[PDB]
């Protein structure tokens, strides 16, 4: 009814321990969503063109030319870790569990309130907000996944992370087809390369509308819309990292001489010469069996061509890399490729009382040792004389193509049938939870943006829009814009995400690295005297696991 509520606020996460060390995690989340009427009631087709920026030779990485369809609908997106967990629940899950399953997902909309602004133009020009009890909110649930899938976590435009703060939805848009061609150059190149935007191929035109595809529900004040329960079928995401490289697989060599005194410089020693040892190598012309030459079962990780831009029908793009380097060799100073860098605003983890429009940034360096250190690689000739000569090695200090800043590791690629690698780790709080698999014949082995991939079907997207509120003067045969009453809405969203985890067990004599609070990160978890909150990122794969 008019003065009857249709739902209940709930933002609790529960832990229900089953038998055999399985625990059912059910995270609830509720928000207050503020929605304005759209700027235009029509679908647009806008072409973005920053050709003045890439007209300077060398700046071809800054390309932004694309085409998109601007729709009057808005999207409610809750596909991020920080929507469902606070740092206490995340510390509990990360420290106590070993693997994670994704079970189900629901959402609903209740307690709709529509108000109209009537700006009484005084000399202090005021505005009185009145309830419009007969206005409607239009809600479309794309359960068959007919619309193009747009995850909002990649643009940092999901729901907010604080339960006591009102949030906004994202204006929806999708990509339209275009053709462009950009020839690269460098600073000090004679002439201008081709920088051409061709247009649209008629064989690839797809124009989607919400009205022709999805049934749209009209919600007044006493109405309530509830999505049913979707059920996932996914692979488990493991909360442990591996440390073993190719240099630490299998049986170590037997030491015939052990140290007799304590110290960091009392080393052990194999008492056999390198040309008198036993074991298997893969060098048919070499009697040396060392730690770098001994045969391993497979290879962990691979080398990829890093900072490689590939061009296609719609312009250049960067090549994605599955796992980057990180650990004792690389810091914030030592720049690497493969580690993602997140940017976000005050709604998603930045300090709420900060000044300026510069976002907050961090680079996520994972714990799994599956990367490569490109400054220590080399090729050598198959003759394999051990004091190697100048013209028999390919070093990373040798120029490729005459360019002194390019070596062979920039174009190297060692992916093969012996390559083993790991899935991507979850990133709290800004990371995505699930993702959709590509509708192609040969599917990729992993995604670099989400730990779960719903294979057959994913949860349908939820669209929302304020219904048009017309005035007395309205002529559809006139070419001008539709004149509407200034209306906005407030509704309550409530979701429920259910997981399933397994409690970890101790295997070693020594303790394990855990997530804790100390004197350094103390004031990152409490509000300030004004109420400024923030959410700093936390690691997810803390405990180690033996690979082999």
Binding mask 407-426 for a second copy (x = CB under 8 A): --------------------
- Which tokens go with 455? 């294979």
Rounded Cα gap, residues 248 and 421, in angstroms: 15
Our finding on whether 187 is near a second copy (CB under 8 A) is no
**Cα-only R_g, the chain:** 29
Encode burial over 531-543: b for 16+ CB neighbours within 10 A, e otherwise.
eebbbebbbbbbb
Our finding on whether 436 is near a second copy (CB under 8 A) is yes
**Shortest gap between Cβ of 479 and a second copy (angstroms)?**
6
Q: Considering only residues 273 through 302, tell me which ones interact with a second copy, judged by CB under 8 A.
A: none
Residue 152 near residue 168, CB atoms below 8 Å: no
Our finding on whether 120 is near a second copy (CB under 8 A) is yes
Our finding on whether 503 is near a second copy (CB under 8 A) is yes
Return the number of the residue (208 or 384) whose C-beta is nearest a second copy. Answer: 208
Q: What is the 3-state secondary structure (H, E, C) of 53-69?
A: CCCCCCCHHHCCCEEEE
User: Can you tell me which of 82, 169, 429, 544 binds a second copy, judged by CB under 8 A?
Assistant: 544
User: Can you tell me which of 223, 234, 388, 394 binds a second copy, judged by CB under 8 A?
Assistant: 223
Residue 411 near residue 304, CB atoms below 8 Å: no
Q: Considering only residues 90 through 109, tell me which ones interact with a second copy, judged by CB under 8 A.
A: 90-92, 95
**Shortest gap between Cβ of 25 and a second copy (angstroms)?**
11
Our finding on whether 15 is near a second copy (CB under 8 A) is yes
- Segment contacting a second copy by CB under 8 A, of 110-118, 280-288, 360-368, 383-391: 110-118
Rounded Cα gap, residues 118 and 281, in angstroms: 83
**Shortest gap between Cβ of 524 and a second copy (angstroms)?**
9
Specify burial of residue 239 (Cβ count, 10 A radius: 0-12, 13-18, 19+). buried
Between the alpha carbon of residue 34 and those of residues 75, 116, 160, the distances in Å are 12, 13, 12
Rounded Cα gap, residues 525 and 410, in angstroms: 42
Our finding on whether 255 is near a second copy (CB under 8 A) is no
Our finding on whether 307 is near a second copy (CB under 8 A) is no
User: Can you tell me which of 22, 42, 233, 334 binds a second copy, judged by CB under 8 A?
Assistant: 42
Q: Is 144 annotated as a binding residue?
A: yes
Return the number of the residue (68 or 181) whose C-beta is nearest a second copy. Answer: 68
Return the number of the residue (302 or 434) whose C-beta is nearest a second copy. Answer: 434
- Which tokens go with 32? 């207050």
Our finding on whether 468 is near a second copy (CB under 8 A) is yes
Q: Considering only residues 512 through 531, tell me which ones interact with a second copy, judged by CB under 8 A.
A: 512-519, 522, 525-531
Between the alpha carbon of residue 22 and those of residues 353, 424, 501, 541, the distances in Å are 41, 23, 6, 19
| Distance from the Cα of residue 431 to its chain's centroid | 5
> Which residue do the tokens 């192609």 mark?
440
User: Can you tell me which of 5, 192, 334, 483 binds a second copy, judged by CB under 8 A?
Assistant: 5
Our finding on whether 24 is near a second copy (CB under 8 A) is no
**Shortest gap between Cβ of 34 and a second copy (angstroms)?**
5
Residue 517 near residue 63, CB atoms below 8 Å: no
**Shortest gap between Cβ of 531 and a second copy (angstroms)?**
3
Our finding on whether 443 is near a second copy (CB under 8 A) is no
DSSP symbol at 325:
-
Cβ-Cβ contacts under 8 Å for 370 (sequence gap 6 or more): 242, 300, 301, 323, 421, 422
Show binding-site residues for Mg(2+).
144
Show binding-site residues.
144
């Amino acid at each position: 009814g008019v003065g009857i509520s249709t739902g209940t606020f709930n933002n609790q996460t529960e832990f229900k321990f089953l038998e055999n060390g399985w625990v059912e995690i059910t995270a609830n989340s509720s928000r207050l969503v503020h929605l304005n009427m759209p700027e235009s009631e029509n679908y647009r087709r806008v072409v973005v063109n920053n050709m003045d920026k890439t007209a300077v030779n060398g700046n071809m990485a800054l390309d932004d030319i694309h085409a998109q369809i601007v729709t009057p609908w808005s999207l409610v997106d809750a596909n991020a870790w920080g929507v469902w967990f606070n740092p206490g629940d995340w510390q509990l899950i990360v420290n106590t569990m070993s693997e994670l399953h994704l079970v189900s997902f629901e959402q609903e909309i209740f307690n709709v309130v529509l108000k109209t602004v009537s700006e009484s133009a005084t000399q202090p020009p005021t505005k009185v907000y009145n309830n419009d009890l007969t206005a409607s909110l239009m809600v479309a649930l794309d359960s068959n996944n007919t619309m193009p899938f747009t995850p909002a976590a990649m643009r940092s435009e999901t729901l907010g992370f604080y339960p006591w703060k009102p949030t906004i939805p994202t204006p929806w848009r999708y990509y339209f087809q275009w053709d462009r061609t950009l020839i690269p150059s460098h600073t000090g190149t004679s002439g201008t390369p081709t920088n051409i935007y061709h247009g649209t191929d008629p064989d690839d035109v797809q124009f989607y509308t919400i009205e022709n595809s999805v049934p749209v529900h009209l919600l007044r004040t006493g109405d309530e819309f509830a999505t049913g329960t979707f059920f996932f079928d996914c692979k488990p995401c493991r909360l442990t990292h591996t440390w073993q490289t190719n240099r630490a697989l299998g049986l170590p060599p037997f030491l015939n001489s052990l140290p007799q005194s304590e110290g960091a410089t009392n080393f052990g020693d194999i008492g056999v010469q390198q040309d008198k040892r036993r074991g298997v190598t893969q060098m048919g012309n070499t009697n040396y069996i060392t730690e770098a030459t001994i045969m391993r079962p497979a290879e962990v990780g691979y080398s990829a061509p890093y900072y490689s831009f590939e061009a296609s029908t719609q312009g250049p793009f960067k090549t994605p890399i599955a796992a980057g380097r990180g650990g004792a060799q690389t810091d914030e100073n030592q720049a690497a490729d493969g580690n993602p860098r997140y940017a976000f605003g005050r709604q998603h983890g930045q300090k709420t009382t900060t000044t300026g429009e510069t976002p907050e940034r961090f680079t996520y360096i994972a714990h799994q040792d599956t990367g490569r250190y490109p400054e220590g690689d080399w090729i050598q000739n198959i003759n394999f004389n051990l004091p190697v000569t100048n013209d028999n090695v390919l070093l990373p200090t040798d120029p490729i193509g005459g360019k002194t800043g390019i070596n062979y590791t920039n174009i190297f690629n060692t992916y093969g049938p012996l390559t083993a690698l790991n899935n991507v780790p979850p990133v709290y709080p800004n990371g995505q939870i699930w993702d959709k698999e590509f509708d192609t014949d040969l599917k990729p082995r992993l995604h670099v943006n989400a730990p779960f991939v719903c294979q057959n079907n994913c949860p349908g997207q939820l669209f929302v829009k304020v219904a048009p509120n017309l005035t007395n003067e309205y002529d559809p045969d006139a070419s001008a814009n539709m004149s509407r009453i200034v209306t906005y809405s407030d509704f309550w969203w409530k979701g429920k995400l259910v997981f399933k985890a397994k409690l970890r067990a101790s295997h070693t004599w020594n303790p394990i690295q855990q997530m804790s609070i100390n004197v350094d990160n103390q004031f990152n978890y409490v509000p300030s005297n004004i109420g400024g909150m923030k959410i700093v990122y936390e690691k997810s794969q803390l405990a180690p696991r033996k690979l082999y």
